[PDB]
Amino acid sequence: TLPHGHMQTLIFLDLEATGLPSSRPEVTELCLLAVHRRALENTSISQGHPPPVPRPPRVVDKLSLCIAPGKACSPGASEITGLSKAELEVQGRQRFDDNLAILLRAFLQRQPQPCCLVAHNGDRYDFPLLQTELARLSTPSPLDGTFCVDSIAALKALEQASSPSGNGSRKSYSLGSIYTRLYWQAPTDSHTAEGDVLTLLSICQWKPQALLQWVDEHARPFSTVKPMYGT
DNA sequence: GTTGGCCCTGGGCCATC
Ligand SMILES: [Mg+2]
Ligand SMILES: [Mg+2]
């Protein structure tokens, strides 16, 4: 049974940032793609080998923002994301501030509840980092009433259900690895927030109903997510 | 990941930017 009822909204989420967790990173870009449960329930499965990449539902809400970090990106981070602190400031990007939190709140309020965030390795990166970024602000966390799941665990379950191999053979569950296994194509616009969100949506549309059920079964409160680091 | 949070039977696995 379900610990928090049926999720009515799935918000696929990705961030770009200044580096990996040990660097105490800051968000440089974020993308939200909100899809209603019904749009997933009515997603048509293809049984092709490989199946074609599914198209996103007609009805979606999308938000994509570039964000000026308080610290510089690592050379690696810059090279893969195509972003830098200097260039973001040049183009007048504002920081992760109260106005952004208010922006996120209004966007989230337009989505039916309960709502569940979906992010690849979200449990170990995206969710803790958002918790940290939002905790810095006086604006109450816009995500405090929302739930969240990690799509890695989701896809491990779904792929292992599909017949072998592996059959106990280990494989990568990186975003790109999954996408390529499922669709035999390289993902496009890699390590851009919107690009990776669309990639995430695609692998989540591989088995729409099975994913929805898994999400409903494993959704936990975002309020329970430990911040990546502290002030 | 160059880390570090997991799972395992002092180490191996492996993903986010
Ligand atoms: Mg990501
Ligand atoms: Mg990304």
DSSP string, A4-29: S---SEEEEEEEEESS-GGG---EEE
Q: Which of residues 134-173 of A touch strand B (CB under 7 A)?
A: 152, 170, 172-173
Query: Residue A157 corresponds to which tokens in the numbers above?
Result: 């379950």
Helix (H, G, I), strand (E, B) or coil at A39: helix
| CB hemisphere CA count around A185 (13 angstroms) | 14
- How far, in Å, from the CA of A25 to the mean position of ligand 2? 14
Domain boundaries, chain A: 6-225
Q: What is the dihedral of CA A145, A150, A155, A161, to 10 degrees?
A: -70
Integer Cα distance of A43 and A57 in angstroms: 8
A163: its two tokens: 């017949």
Q: Which two tokens stand for residue A41?
A: 């329930």
Write down the experimental method used for this entry. Answer: X-ray
Determine the distance separating the centroid of ligand 1 and the alpha carbon of A216, expressed in angstroms. Answer: 22
- Within 7 Å: CB of A224 and strand B? no
Q: What class does CATH assign to A6-225? A: alpha beta
Structure resolution in Å? 2.0
End-to-end Cα separation, chain A, in angstroms: 39
Q: What residues does A64 pair with on adjacent strands?
A: A31
Residue A176, CA: closest nucleotide via C1'? B15
| Closest nucleotide to A18 by C1' from CA | B17
